[PDB]
Design a protein around this motif. Structure first.
Motif, PDB file in Angstrom:
ATOM      1  N   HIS A  83       0.837  -1.190   0.000  1.00  0.00           N
ATOM      2  CA  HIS A  83       0.000   0.000   0.000  1.00  0.00           C
ATOM      3  C   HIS A  83       0.876   1.245   0.000  1.00  0.00           C
ATOM      4  O   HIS A  83       1.628   1.479   0.954  1.00  0.00           O
ATOM      5  N   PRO A  84       0.809   2.063  -1.050  1.00  0.00           N
ATOM      6  CA  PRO A  84       1.691   3.236  -1.129  1.00  0.00           C
ATOM      7  C   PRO A  84       1.446   4.275  -0.052  1.00  0.00           C
ATOM      8  O   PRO A  84       2.330   5.100   0.197  1.00  0.00           O
ATOM      9  N   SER A  85       0.282   4.270   0.595  1.00  0.00           N
ATOM     10  CA  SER A  85      -0.038   5.290   1.587  1.00  0.00           C
ATOM     11  C   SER A  85       0.483   4.923   2.973  1.00  0.00           C
ATOM     12  O   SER A  85       1.275   5.665   3.562  1.00  0.00           O
ATOM     13  N   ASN A  86       0.046   3.786   3.506  1.00  0.00           N
ATOM     14  CA  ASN A  86       0.379   3.395   4.868  1.00  0.00           C
ATOM     15  C   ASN A  86       0.685   1.908   4.906  1.00  0.00           C
ATOM     16  O   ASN A  86      -0.107   1.099   4.417  1.00  0.00           O
ATOM     17  N   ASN A  87       1.831   1.550   5.488  1.00  0.00           N
ATOM     18  CA  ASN A  87       2.178   0.142   5.626  1.00  0.00           C
ATOM     19  C   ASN A  87       1.288  -0.577   6.630  1.00  0.00           C
ATOM     20  O   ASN A  87       1.211  -1.809   6.600  1.00  0.00           O
TER      21      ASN A  87
END
Ligand code: MG
Ligand code: MG
Ligand code: MG
Ligand code: MG
Ligand code: MG
Ligand code: MG
Ligand code: MG
Ligand code: MG
Ligand code: MG
Ligand code: MG
Ligand code: MG
Ligand code: MG
Ligand code: MG
Ligand code: MG
Ligand code: MG
Ligand code: MG
Ligand code: MG
Ligand code: MG
Ligand code: MG
Ligand code: MG
Ligand code: MG
Ligand code: MG
Ligand code: MG
Ligand code: MG
Ligand code: MG
Ligand code: MG
Ligand code: MG
Ligand code: MG
Ligand code: MG
Ligand code: MG
Ligand code: MG
Ligand code: MG
Ligand code: MG
Ligand code: MG
Ligand code: MG
Ligand code: MG
Ligand code: MG
Ligand code: MG
Ligand code: MG
Ligand code: MG
Ligand code: MG
Ligand code: MG
Ligand code: MG
Ligand code: MG
Ligand code: MG
Ligand code: MG
Ligand code: MG
Ligand code: MG
Ligand code: MG
Ligand code: MG
Ligand code: MG
Ligand code: MG
Lengths: 203, 260, 141
Positions: A83-87
RNA sequence: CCCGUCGCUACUACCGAUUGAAUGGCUUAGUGAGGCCUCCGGAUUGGUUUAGGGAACCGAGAAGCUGGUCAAACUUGGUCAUUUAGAGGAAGUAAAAGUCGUAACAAGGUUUCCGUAGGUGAACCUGCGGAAGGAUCAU
RNA sequence: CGGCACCUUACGAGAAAUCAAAGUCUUUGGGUUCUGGGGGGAGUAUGGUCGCAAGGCUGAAACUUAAAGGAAUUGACGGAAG
RNA sequence: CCGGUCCUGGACCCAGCCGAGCCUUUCCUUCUGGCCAGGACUUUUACUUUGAAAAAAUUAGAGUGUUCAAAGCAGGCCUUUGCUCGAAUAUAUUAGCAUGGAAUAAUAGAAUAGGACGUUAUGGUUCU
RNA sequence: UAUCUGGUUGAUCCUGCCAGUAGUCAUAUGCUUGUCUCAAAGAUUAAGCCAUGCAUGUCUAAGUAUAAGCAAUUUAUACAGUGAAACUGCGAAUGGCUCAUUAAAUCAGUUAUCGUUUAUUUGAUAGUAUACUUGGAUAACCGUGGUAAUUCUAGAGCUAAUACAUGCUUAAAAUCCCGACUGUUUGGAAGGGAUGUAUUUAUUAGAUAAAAAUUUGAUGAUUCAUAAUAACUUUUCGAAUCGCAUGGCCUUGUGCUGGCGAUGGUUCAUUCAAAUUUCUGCCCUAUCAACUUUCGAUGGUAGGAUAGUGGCCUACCAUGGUUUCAACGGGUAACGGGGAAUAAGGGUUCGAUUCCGGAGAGGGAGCCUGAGAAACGGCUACC
RNA sequence: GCCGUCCGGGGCACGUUUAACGAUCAACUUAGAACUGGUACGGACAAGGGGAAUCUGACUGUCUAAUUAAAACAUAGCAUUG
C-alpha cells in the motif's frame, strides 16, 4: 462532528482565525470504512440529496479486469501485499483504492485455456505436466481448433504475468473505492507498472 | 440559510413589473418554471396590474381556477406561474391572445395578437447536445427540450415552435443581417439587425446592432434574440413602437404633437 | 530527477499502454491544449513527467481569470509564488499608493522558472490550500 | 510686578508590604456526559420454511457490550485583560493671599538664560563650557 | 568661477521687528525629510529600550484653566547714559 | 451670404471647428474564403475616451391641480357596455470586462551579435 | 449666503484658543399644545430574566371511512352524500426578531464550477428477453388499566391503503460469445447462453493541412456529451393506485377494445436554490516587529472522507508560508452594504433600525428527520 | 603433461562518473505501531520535597582532635604605611 471546513485552519499568513459560525451540516465528514477481507458486510449511508453510499466493511470477491486481454472476471481477493499510503494497511489487510492485492487466478486461467488452448504458469511438476497435456488433448471440433489456431501468436503473454499463474495468485491494484461504493474492483498488474511493484515487494 | 426562500418583498421585486411601493409588504414570488424569476411576469401581475381584469389577488385565483388562462396552449392554474419572453397567453372567454414581448421602455407590453399567430412561438436555442441512446436534442430559452432537431441547428439560433405539438417548424441561423430583439441589459426591448459579432474566447461575445434609425449599440450575445430573417421581416408581430428607442426630447416632442 | 520517485506508480489515469502490442514500445501519452491561444510546450507533448495538476498533461482545466506576475519564490516542489504589483487609488488625496499581492501558482515540469521571471497564470480549480492558479507561460527576466 | 519652601482646606492622579481582592477571555494537564460510527449481543418475532415428537436453518431485531470519533462540562495550573482595597510615601491643582525671605522683570542692585555637576530652609548659590533672547552691531 | 560676509532699496514678503531671502505664497502645486495644533499638569507617571551610574531615547492620562504668548506704541519707573 | 422667412429648410461663397483618405523614404499585424467570417503571430504597463455593468428604495430629475403641500405613481378624454399618454432620464465609480487614442510617465530590444530578412535562397537533421 | 462676531492691552496689530451662531432620519428632557395629512417608537444600559395568552398548520370529483357521527332514500346489498378521529402525503429549513460574536472574517462590485448537490415547477424520457391483480402487519375504534403530575402511555380484540414488503403481463428482428456435429481450405451449423435502465471497474469510438505512386456533436479548452466491449451489484426502477364519463367492434362472451384527468416514477434538461470560488476594497494601535511549523504551518505523492474541489483528515516526504507596501498581536462604547446628517468645492461624522447579505436563538457541543437544518415555537447531554 | 595464483602481451567484446547498483559482513542506539494484563510497569535495588520572604556572610575554602562549623577566620577586591 467531523468537519471539512477551512475555517478552523490558520490562514496562509499563519494567523489564527476567530470562530465565525457553528459547524454546518453541509461540510461534514464521516468515519473511514476500513474495508477488511471477510464475509461480505456492506452498510448503506444516507448522503446529501437523499443519495446513497455503501460502506464495504468486509468483502471477499471483486471484479478484476485483464487489460491486455480485454476480459473481466469476478474473483476472490487473497490479501493486501503493498500500500503506497500506509504500511499499516498491509499489516491489517485493509482494502482501499490503489492497494496492491493478490487475487485468485483461476477464473482468468479458465478463460485463457478456453480462449487459446495453451496453459499458464509453465511449471514442470507432475500435476502441471498432466494439466498441460489435459488442455492440449481436450476434445474439440475441427472448426474450434481452427478458431483457436487463428488466435495463436497473440497467445504469448508477458513473462512476469505468466509466471504468477504457477502460484495461482495474480497481482492486482484496487481501482474502486470500497468505502464509497461498496465495490472492491481493480485491474491486473502488467507492463512496467507490474515491474515497479515487483521491486517494492522483493526489496 | 437552511433552505429556499418563499417570500418576495415588494421593494425587492423586479422593477419592470411596475409595482407600487405602498400597496403592501410583499410581492408575488414567481414559482419555479420555464423562465427565470428576474426575467418573468407572474400571471397575477399580468391579470391584475396590467389587464386590470381582476381587482385583487383573490379574484385572479378565481379567474384561473375556472380554466380560463392558457400559457403556451396549456391551462395553468398557478397564479404565480412565471410567464416570460415570447410566451402566448390565451383567454378564450374574452377571445384574446397576448404575446409577452418587451417594449422599448424595458417592460412587458400588453401586445394582442391574432389567433393564427397565437398558434406558434419562437425560442432561442441555448444548447444542442446528445441525450441518452444518442438522440440529439435542443434546449430553448424557455426550458423546452425538442428531440431530433434539424442537424443544422446550433446555439443562438431561433426555432419556431408549433406550440400545439411542440415540434420545430423551421429555424433561423444566427448571422449578420438577422433581425434581433434585445432581451437584457439597458438596451432591453430594442430591435435591430446584427452588424458584427465580436468574439472573446473565455469571456462574453459582443454583438453590434444597428437600429432602423441607423443607431448602433453593443450588447452581450446572451441578451440577443433572433426574431427575423432580415430587416423588416420579423417572425412575430412587434409591439407598438417597433423597438425603436427615442430620446427623451423626441418623446416629449411626440407627446406634444399627439395631444395637440 | 526521475519520474518514479514516489511510493506509488506515477501514470496518467486511464491511458493504457497495451504490452501485447506492436514493436512501437512507446508509452502512450495524453495531452491537451488549454485554449485561449496558449501554446502547449513540447516538453509536455514529448516529455515523460507525470503531473495530475499540469494544465497540458494533467486533468486540470484553465477557466476564469488570467494573471501575470513576477516570480519571487521557487522553493516549493512544483509550486511557485508570484508577486503582483499595482497602484491603489486614494480619492481624498487624488493620488496612488504602491501595493502588492502574493499569489501561489502551480508550475508543471514542462516549464523552468527562476526567481525574477514574468509568468502568466490561469485560474483552475482549487488544487491546494492556497493554490488556484497554474502557470501557462514563462517570460525570462 | 513677582518666585519658591513651610502651614490649613478640598479635589485628581501616582507609588506602595499585602506571593491584595474580584470579574472575563485564551490555554496545558487530568477527569469526562452525550450523540454518531463500529463490534459483538440476541429480550421477542416472522417463517428460506424442513421435520414424526418437532429438530432445525433463513430473515428482522430491542436493551446492553467493544473500540474509535466529535466533544460539552468540571478541577488544577499558567497567562492575558478589565475593575478595585490598602498603613505609609511623594506630587499636582484650586482656594486664601497665612509664615520666611526677595530669586526674576531697571546693569532688579552679583546681567540673564542653556547643558552638566555639586551644595543649600526656600526662592537659589557655585564650578566648567556655551548663548545674546545684553547692558556692546563701533575705536 | 567658488566661498565668509557686508552696504543701499523694497519690485516683493511679513503682525511687526525685520528679510536678497523670511521674495517668485488665495494670481495658492519644482523635489523631499522632520516637527507643531490654546496655557498648565509635563518631558511628569507608566511600559519599553540603551547606560556602570548620572541619565538618554520613546512617552500619556486624570485634573485644571481664559488666557498664556509675539512684535510694536504712549507713558511711568531704573541703585543706565548724555 | 445666399433666403429658399412659415422661428424654419438646399449646392454654390467665405472663414472657423471636428473628422477622414491618399502622396510625400512612411509606421497602421498577417493568410484563406472574396468589410464579414475562418485560421497563424503578438514587449509589458500606467493614463484617458466610449460601451456594458454597478438591484429596488433613497438622491437629482421629466410628467401629473394629492383642493395646495409633504407625498403618491398616478392619470386624461362628452361621460363612454370604451378609447387612451404613462410609470421617463441622469448620477454611481474604486476593482473587473470590451473599446478608441499613443501626448505624458515607465518598460523591452542588435555589442564577445547567440541580431533581422530571404516571401519561392541552397542543402541537411528530424516530427506528423 | 463660498459670511463671521465677543474675550488677553492704557491703547495697537497678531498667534491662538475659549465663547457666541445654524443644521441633525439625533437622542433625552422642561414648559406649552386647537385642526388636517404622514408616521418613528425597549437599538444604546442588560444577546439581562420572564407570569399569561396567542404566533404552523393542511383535503380535493380524484390515497385510506362499517365513527356503534350527521343526512337522505337512491342509478345502487361491496362502497357512492357530508364528514370528526386516525394512518398516509406535504409544510413546519419560509416568515418574524435581534445585532452578541465577527477586522481579509462578514460584505460590495466582479468571476468560476471542465469542482458539486438540488424537493418542487416546466420540457422531454422507459415494449427488454396468482395478472380478472400477491402477502401480513398497524392506527383510529372497542374495553382492561397505571401514575400526584405531562401533548405519558401499557396489556387485549379488530380493520385499510398512493403506508410497509414482494411480484408477472409484450413487438419485430438483429448482434455477440461458447459451441456438439459438419463442410473439409476454413465455410455451414443444432443447442446453450447476453442484450432495457441504474451501480462499479477496465478497455475502445469520440477523427478532421489542401493532390499524386463510409459516418463522427459541443467547447477557448477536457479523459466532455454520447456510443461500444468484458464483467460486476446484501439488484435501482421499466404503475398490483385514484376520479369522472361511458363510447366503438361484433365471434353478443360480464368478450375484445377505449376518453378526459389525479397521483406517482428513472434519467437528462430547466427553474427555485445551495456549497465552495477569482480579483480589488475595511476603523484605531509599534507603549504590538517579527509571526506560523509539538499536536498542519507551505508544498508533493497516495489514500480516506465529502454532494463535490481542497491539509478537509491520515501516512510518507520536502522546508516551506506571511511581513515596514505594516505581517502577527491588541482595541473597537465594530455585523457589512444600499444609504443618513452636514455640506461652494474637496471633505468630516454616522449607518442597531423598513431593502440585500451574514450570524444567533441563555452558553457551548452533538445529532434525528428531511431535497434542504448542525433547526432550537426539533431532540440529546453538560453549565 | 597436470592444475591453479606470480609477471605480461592479441584483438572481438566488456567501465566512462544512473556503483543512484550488487555481494558478503557487522555494534547497539533511536523512533513509531499492534496486541496483551486485576491500570500493572525507574514493580526489588537505586533515588531532589517544593514555594513566598526577612536577618546575616558575597562566593569555593578554614578552625576550637574530645560539648560551639557559625554571622567567626581566610579570600579576591579596596586603601593606607615603610
Ligand atoms: Mg478579537
Ligand atoms: Mg436525486
Ligand atoms: Mg447565502
Ligand atoms: Mg404556489
Ligand atoms: Mg465559460
Ligand atoms: Mg480630493
Ligand atoms: Mg495570598
Ligand atoms: Mg483536555
Ligand atoms: Mg486586553
Ligand atoms: Mg532681586
Ligand atoms: Mg544682593
Ligand atoms: Mg541679579
Ligand atoms: Mg555656593
Ligand atoms: Mg506689505
Ligand atoms: Mg539688508
Ligand atoms: Mg541674511
Ligand atoms: Mg497643548
Ligand atoms: Mg513684549
Ligand atoms: Mg465571398
Ligand atoms: Mg439604485
Ligand atoms: Mg470603471
Ligand atoms: Mg499678554
Ligand atoms: Mg481692559
Ligand atoms: Mg463651539
Ligand atoms: Mg445646537
Ligand atoms: Mg418590554
Ligand atoms: Mg425594534
Ligand atoms: Mg358516512
Ligand atoms: Mg408540494
Ligand atoms: Mg429567516
Ligand atoms: Mg491588525
Ligand atoms: Mg417531471
Ligand atoms: Mg394489538
Ligand atoms: Mg411507497
Ligand atoms: Mg487527493
Ligand atoms: Mg496533498
Ligand atoms: Mg500529517
Ligand atoms: Mg460601522
Ligand atoms: Mg458589537
Ligand atoms: Mg446595518
Ligand atoms: Mg449594540
Ligand atoms: Mg435583515
Ligand atoms: Mg433572553
Ligand atoms: Mg441551550
Ligand atoms: Mg441549536
Ligand atoms: Mg420562542
Ligand atoms: Mg425558528
Ligand atoms: Mg560564608
Ligand atoms: Mg566544587
Ligand atoms: Mg569540638
Ligand atoms: Mg560539632
Ligand atoms: Mg570576615
Amino acid at each position: 462532528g467531523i468537519s471539512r471546513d477551512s475555517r478552523h485552519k490558520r490562514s496562509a499568513t499563519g494567523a489564527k482565525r476567530a470562530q465565525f459560525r457553528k459547524k454546518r451540516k453541509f461540510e461534514l465528514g464521516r468515519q473511514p470504512a476500513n474495508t477488511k477481507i471477510g464475509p461480505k458486510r456492506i452498510h448503506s449511508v444516507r448522503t446529501r440529496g437523499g443519495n446513497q453510499k455503501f460502506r464495504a466493511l468486509r468483502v471477499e470477491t471483486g471484479n478484476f479486469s485483464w487489460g491486455s486481454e480485454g476480459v473481466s472476471r469476478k474473483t476472490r481477493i487473497a490479501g493486501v501485499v503493498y500500500h503506497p499510503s500506509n504500511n499499516e494497511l498491509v499489516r491489517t489487510n485493509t482494502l482501499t483504492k490503489s492497494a496492491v492485492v493478490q487475487i485468485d487466478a483461476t477464473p482468468f486461467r479458465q478463460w485463457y485455456e478456453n480462449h487459446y488452448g495453451a496453459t499458464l504458469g509453465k511449471k514442470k511438476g507432475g500435476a502441471h505436466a498432466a494439466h498441460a497435456a489435459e488442455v492440449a488433448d481436450a476434445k474439440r471440433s475441427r472448426k474450434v481448433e481452427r478458431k483457436l489456431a487463428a488466435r495463436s501468436g497473440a497467445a504469448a503473454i508477458e513473462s512476469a504475468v505468466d509466471s504468477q499463474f504457477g502460484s495461482g495468485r495474480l497481482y492486482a491494484v484496487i481501482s474502486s473505492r470500497p468505502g464509497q461504493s461498496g465495490r472492491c474492483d481493480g485491474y491486473i498488474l502488467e507492463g512496467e507498472e507490474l515491474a515497479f511493484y515487483l521491486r517494492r515487494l522483493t526489496a | 440559510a437552511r433552505g429556499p426562500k418563499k417570500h418576495l418583498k415588494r421593494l425587492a421585486a423586479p422593477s419592470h413589473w411596475m409595482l407600487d411601493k405602498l400597496s403592501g409588504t410583499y410581492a408575488p414570488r414567481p414559482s419555479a418554471g420555464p423562465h427565470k424569476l428576474r426575467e418573468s411576469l407572474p400571471l397575477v401581475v399580468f391579470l391584475r396590474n396590467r389587464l386590470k381584469y381582476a381587482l385583487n389577488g383573490r379574484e385572479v385565483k378565481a379567474i384561473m381556477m375556472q380554466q380560463h388562462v392558457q400559457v403556451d396552449g396549456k391551462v395553468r392554474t398557478d397564479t404565480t406561474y412565471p410567464a416570460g419572453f415570447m410566451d402566448v397567453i390565451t383567454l378564450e372567454a374574452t377571445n384574446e391572445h397576448f404575446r409577452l414581448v418587451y417594449d422599448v421602455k424595458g417592460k412587458f407590453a400588453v401586445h394582442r395578437i391574432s389567433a393564427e399567430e397565437a398558434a406558434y412561438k419562437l425560442g432561442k436555442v441555448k444548447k444542442v447536445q446528445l441525450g441518452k441512446k444518442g438522440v440529439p436534442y435542443v434546449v430553448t430559452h424557455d426550458g423546452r427540450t425538442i428531440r431530433y432537431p434539424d442537424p443544422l441547428i446550433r446555439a443562438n439560433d431561433t426555432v419556431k415552435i408549433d406550440l400545439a405539438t411542440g415540434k420545430i417548424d423551421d429555424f433561423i441561423k444566427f448571422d449578420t443581417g438577422r433581425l434581433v430583439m434585445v432581451t437584457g441589459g439597458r438596451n432591453l426591448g430594442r430591435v435591430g439587425v446584427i452588424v458584427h459579432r465580436e468574439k472573446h474566447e473565455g469571456g462574453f461575445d459582443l454583438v453590434h446592432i444597428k437600429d432602423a434609425l441607423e443607431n448602433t449599440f453593443v450588447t452581450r450575445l446572451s441578451n440577443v434574440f433572433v426574431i427575423g430573417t432580415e430587416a423588416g421581416k420579423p417572425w412575430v408581430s412587434l409591439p407598438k413602437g417597433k423597438g425603436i428607442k427615442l430620446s427623451i426630447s423626441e418623446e416629449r416632442d411626440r407627446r406634444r404633437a399627439q395631444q395637440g | 530527477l526521475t519520474v518514479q520517485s514516489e511510493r506509488a506508480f506515477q501514470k496518467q489515469p486511464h491511458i493504457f499502454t497495451n504490452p501485447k502490442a506492436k514493436a512501437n514500445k512507446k508509452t502512450k501519452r495524453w495531452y491537451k491544449d488549454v485554449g485561449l491561444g496558449f501554446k502547449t510546450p513540447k516538453a509536455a507533448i514529448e516529455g515523460s513527467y507525470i503531473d495530475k495538476k499540469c494544465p497540458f498533461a494533467g486533468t486540470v482545466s484553465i477557466r476564469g481569470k488570467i494573471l501575470t506576475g513576477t516570480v519571487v519564490s521557487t522553493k516549493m516542489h512544483r509550486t511557485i509564488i508570484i508577486r503582483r504589483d499595482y497602484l491603489h487609488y486614494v480619492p481624498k488625496y487624488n493620488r496612488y499608493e504602491k501595493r502588492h499581492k502574493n499569489v501561489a501558482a502551480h508550475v508543471s515540469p514542462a516549464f523552468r522558472v527562476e526567481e525574477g521571471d514574468v509568468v502568466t497564470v490561469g485560474q483552475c480549480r482549487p488544487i491546494s490550500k492556497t493554490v488556484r492558479f497554474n502557470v501557462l507561460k514563462v517570460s525570462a527576466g
